[PDB]
Design a protein around this ligand. Structure first.
Ligand SMILES: [Mg+2]
Ligand SMILES: [Mg+2]
Ligand SMILES: [Mg+2]
Ligand SMILES: [Mg+2]
Ligand SMILES: [Mg+2]
Ligand SMILES: [Mg+2]
Ligand SMILES: [Mg+2]
Ligand SMILES: [Mg+2]
Ligand SMILES: [Mg+2]
Ligand SMILES: [Mg+2]
Ligand SMILES: [Mg+2]
Ligand SMILES: [Mg+2]
Ligand SMILES: [Mg+2]
Ligand SMILES: [Mg+2]
Ligand SMILES: [Mg+2]
Ligand SMILES: [Mg+2]
Ligand SMILES: [Mg+2]
Ligand SMILES: [Mg+2]
Ligand SMILES: [Mg+2]
Ligand SMILES: [Mg+2]
Ligand SMILES: [Mg+2]
Ligand SMILES: [Mg+2]
Ligand SMILES: [Mg+2]
Ligand SMILES: [Mg+2]
Ligand SMILES: [Mg+2]
Ligand SMILES: [Mg+2]
Ligand SMILES: [Mg+2]
Ligand SMILES: [Mg+2]
Ligand SMILES: [Mg+2]
Ligand SMILES: [Mg+2]
Ligand SMILES: [Mg+2]
Ligand SMILES: [Mg+2]
Ligand SMILES: [Mg+2]
Ligand SMILES: [Mg+2]
Ligand SMILES: [Mg+2]
Ligand SMILES: [Mg+2]
Ligand SMILES: [Mg+2]
Ligand SMILES: [Mg+2]
Ligand SMILES: [Mg+2]
Ligand SMILES: [Mg+2]
Ligand SMILES: [Mg+2]
Ligand SMILES: [Mg+2]
Ligand SMILES: [Mg+2]
Ligand SMILES: [Mg+2]
Ligand SMILES: [Mg+2]
Ligand SMILES: [Mg+2]
Ligand SMILES: [Mg+2]
Ligand SMILES: [Mg+2]
Ligand SMILES: [Mg+2]
Ligand SMILES: [Mg+2]
Ligand SMILES: [Mg+2]
Ligand SMILES: [Mg+2]
Ligand SMILES: [Mg+2]
Ligand SMILES: [Mg+2]
Ligand SMILES: [Mg+2]
Ligand SMILES: [Mg+2]
Ligand SMILES: [Mg+2]
Ligand SMILES: [Mg+2]
Ligand SMILES: [Mg+2]
Ligand SMILES: [Mg+2]
Ligand SMILES: [Mg+2]
Ligand SMILES: [Mg+2]
Ligand SMILES: [Mg+2]
Ligand SMILES: [Mg+2]
Ligand SMILES: [Mg+2]
Ligand SMILES: [Mg+2]
Ligand SMILES: [Mg+2]
Ligand SMILES: [Mg+2]
Ligand SMILES: [Mg+2]
Ligand SMILES: [Mg+2]
Ligand SMILES: [Mg+2]
Ligand SMILES: [Mg+2]
Ligand SMILES: [Mg+2]
Lengths: 67, 87
RNA sequence: GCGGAGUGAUCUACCCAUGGCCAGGGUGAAGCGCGGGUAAGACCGCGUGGAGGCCCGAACCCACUUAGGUUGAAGACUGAG
RNA sequence: AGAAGGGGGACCGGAAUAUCGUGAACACCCUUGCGGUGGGAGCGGGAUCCGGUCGCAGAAACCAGUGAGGAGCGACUGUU
RNA sequence: CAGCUUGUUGGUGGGGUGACGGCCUACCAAGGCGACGACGGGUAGCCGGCCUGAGAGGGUGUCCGGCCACACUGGGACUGA
RNA sequence: GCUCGUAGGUGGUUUGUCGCGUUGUUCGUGAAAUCUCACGGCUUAACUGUGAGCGUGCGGGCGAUACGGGCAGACUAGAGUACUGCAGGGGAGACUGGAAUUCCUGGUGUAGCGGUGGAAUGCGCAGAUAUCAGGAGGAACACCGGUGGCGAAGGCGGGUCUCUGGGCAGUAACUGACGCUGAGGAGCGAAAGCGUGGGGAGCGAACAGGAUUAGAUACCCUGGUAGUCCACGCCGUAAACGGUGGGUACUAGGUGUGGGUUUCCUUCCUUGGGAUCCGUGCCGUAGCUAACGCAUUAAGUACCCCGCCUGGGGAGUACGGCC
RNA sequence: UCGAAGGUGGGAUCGGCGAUUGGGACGAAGUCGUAACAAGGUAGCCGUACCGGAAGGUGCGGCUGGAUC
């Protein structure tokens, strides 16, 4: 995507009524001025100003790069 | 089929240490051999549904095992795929 | 009109042997490759290929409509479709 | 199904000096041939975008599908 | 209601704004969203609250208070903090 | 109807770490009014003012690590593999056997046969039924055979050969949680039915005649086509039933039967008894149930996942869509 | 250039009416049979196919939510 990375975020939160812990996933889009990140590659992000129409995150560091 | 010695050539070629019979690689090799042989059986006898079900069960078991080896060591998974076949 | 004996397929009907002819455009079947899909398949998407009593349209072969001709240019044609 | 229904179409200049695509001369190797590689001249082809110009009209004359809907009969191409 | 999207998704240079930004433009890449319901259809101003209920819930948004939208219907700008 | 499996949900024992979930504390915020508790003021009350609650939450900091989760390991009890045995109508293909029914040919033979509650239609006298010999052809496989076996279910029994699936027990050799379930999806799926081709003995929807009957589009009788059979496809439904989804653990016994292993009594030849594992029945305690009943093969005690229900009709129907 | 309103065109979608026609429900003390409930007088139901004024009948397979020694 030419200097843009797409990262999937998962979060768990109690069900409002039944009380079960439900797991849900998001998909944010992050910025790479120097595009080096592949599939897998657990990463850390920090949310920023509207760098684009849909981008609000910037890549910080690629920790435990993919196997 | 797969007589004892017939399984022996496969176990020698794909096992790990001179006595390995239950490792994912050995099991996948044996399942692949059985699946192949049953496939030539089923090319004739198109209406042996009761044996085609056994083929399906073997395929499912091999798929679980391949998934497990992929989860545990991707390098072993890749080497085994190249040694046998995928897709 | 009836009978006998002959003459005719150089027109036309069908058949037989042997030759010849059909501008130019369009569409895109089987098959075959590639990729996808799967355990393998079915199946799907692209290419290639160039099928068909296929499409439009000259020569060619017909004869649907109309007008003219109707002591005709012509004992069956001409013009425009 | 070319369903139906719509839009563009001329000329001049520029992009455009390899703009792009065809063929490939002068000059570059070699198992020397009626040989190969680069090379790009001159000669032709086509399309687009931008700007301008003209007329009532840019398919220019000749040429060149009318289309849609509902029934009946025969399935269809053919034959008389 | 199962496929939606081509300024659409992203990048670069410009333009524009009080301000980041496809907000706009030229070029480049081919992405983006979707069964955790995209796209579509119906209905509706939202909330503090009000009514009920043992509570959890259900119904509701009227007085009062906060925010939003609009001013005959649709579009547009100007002046100005 | 049954299975396999995608996303998802859930997950055995054990070590370390993180501190996401969880939990403790503090700061900010959660406007006012309304609401609750206490006062205060209108002669009381409604109403009104004040104070504290409430505001279940969210954000920041600082603690905890039992459980959940992540990350890095370990283990063999679950799961799978290996070896050795074992039982089986599990499946597919090819060849093949005999009894019987029907028909054909011939011999003997003569007047009935057939059928019913009783008859008639019908067949026969042109030689039937009956009986003997030969032949053709199709379908189903007596005894074994059961309550018994195998299969996920539907289902599976004449024999032989070829190919092929699963199960159980023993060993503990191997891997090391690889498990369970499974929305959608895919596959299989009695019979009837459909397409193309073949075959057609018997049976037999439709159809015809007879009889019964008030009538008889039936039951009974005599015939009889599709079909039933085979090859290759489709269809996808059944009271597809245990009217009981799958997995796991636990909770008296008694008594049959199928498949193993096994000491001892080892001969008590007994192939008896005991023990253990896997099936399949009956009876019964606790427990459960409205009752009937179920009861270690749960409809009991619990946990994980899935499907389904929400009065009776209209209706598993219309419209839309998929096949 | 963009641009509301307007015009042209082919579709989508939500309703109303419609000769005629399909079933459904409810009505009285109408007509025709008697399918089910007892072995309901041929055990009944389930799937399917053909047939028949109508309940229904028959064939094939299934079940007991039926019997028999
Ligand atoms: Mg940028
Ligand atoms: Mg004459
Ligand atoms: Mg002659
Ligand atoms: Mg041509
Ligand atoms: Mg092709
Ligand atoms: Mg033609
Ligand atoms: Mg033509
Ligand atoms: Mg000529
Ligand atoms: Mg002619
Ligand atoms: Mg004339
Ligand atoms: Mg004249
Ligand atoms: Mg003419
Ligand atoms: Mg002419
Ligand atoms: Mg057209
Ligand atoms: Mg048309
Ligand atoms: Mg002008
Ligand atoms: Mg034309
Ligand atoms: Mg008609
Ligand atoms: Mg008429
Ligand atoms: Mg015709
Ligand atoms: Mg016809
Ligand atoms: Mg034609
Ligand atoms: Mg653009
Ligand atoms: Mg830009
Ligand atoms: Mg409104
Ligand atoms: Mg209550
Ligand atoms: Mg307005
Ligand atoms: Mg008004
Ligand atoms: Mg206005
Ligand atoms: Mg001012
Ligand atoms: Mg101003
Ligand atoms: Mg899973
Ligand atoms: Mg899991
Ligand atoms: Mg998990
Ligand atoms: Mg755990
Ligand atoms: Mg408050
Ligand atoms: Mg007082
Ligand atoms: Mg806190
Ligand atoms: Mg084990
Ligand atoms: Mg067969
Ligand atoms: Mg016969
Ligand atoms: Mg005789
Ligand atoms: Mg005889
Ligand atoms: Mg080990
Ligand atoms: Mg499963
Ligand atoms: Mg399902
Ligand atoms: Mg099938
Ligand atoms: Mg059948
Ligand atoms: Mg048939
Ligand atoms: Mg039929
Ligand atoms: Mg046939
Ligand atoms: Mg009969
Ligand atoms: Mg009969
Ligand atoms: Mg009759
Ligand atoms: Mg059903
Ligand atoms: Mg059954
Ligand atoms: Mg049921
Ligand atoms: Mg169970
Ligand atoms: Mg259970
Ligand atoms: Mg027992
Ligand atoms: Mg009760
Ligand atoms: Mg009992
Ligand atoms: Mg109960
Ligand atoms: Mg229906
Ligand atoms: Mg329909
Ligand atoms: Mg009407
Ligand atoms: Mg009856
Ligand atoms: Mg009755
Ligand atoms: Mg009766
Ligand atoms: Mg009866
Ligand atoms: Mg009948
Ligand atoms: Mg029936
Ligand atoms: Mg029956």
């Amino acid at each position: 995507m030419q200097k843009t990375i797409v990262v999937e975020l998962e979060d768990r939160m109690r069900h409002p009524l039944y009380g079960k812990i439900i797991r849900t996933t998001k998909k944010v889009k992050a910025h790479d001025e120097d595009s080096v990140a592949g599939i897998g590659d657990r990463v850390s992000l920090m949310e920023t100003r509207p760098l684009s129409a849909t981008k609000r995150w910037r890549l910080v560091e690629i920790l435990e790069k993919a196997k | 089929a797969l007589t004892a010695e017939q399984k022996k050539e496969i176990l020698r070629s794909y096992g790990l240490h001179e006595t390995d019979t239950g490792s994912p690689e050995a099991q996948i090799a044996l399942l692949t051999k059985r699946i192949a042989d049953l496939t030539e059986h089923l090319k004739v006898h198109k209406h042996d549904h009761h044996s085609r079900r056994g083929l399906l069960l073997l395929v499912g078991r091999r798929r679980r095992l391949i998934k497990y080896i992929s989860q545990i060591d991707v390098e072993r998974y890749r080497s085994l795929i190249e040694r046998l076949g995928l897709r």
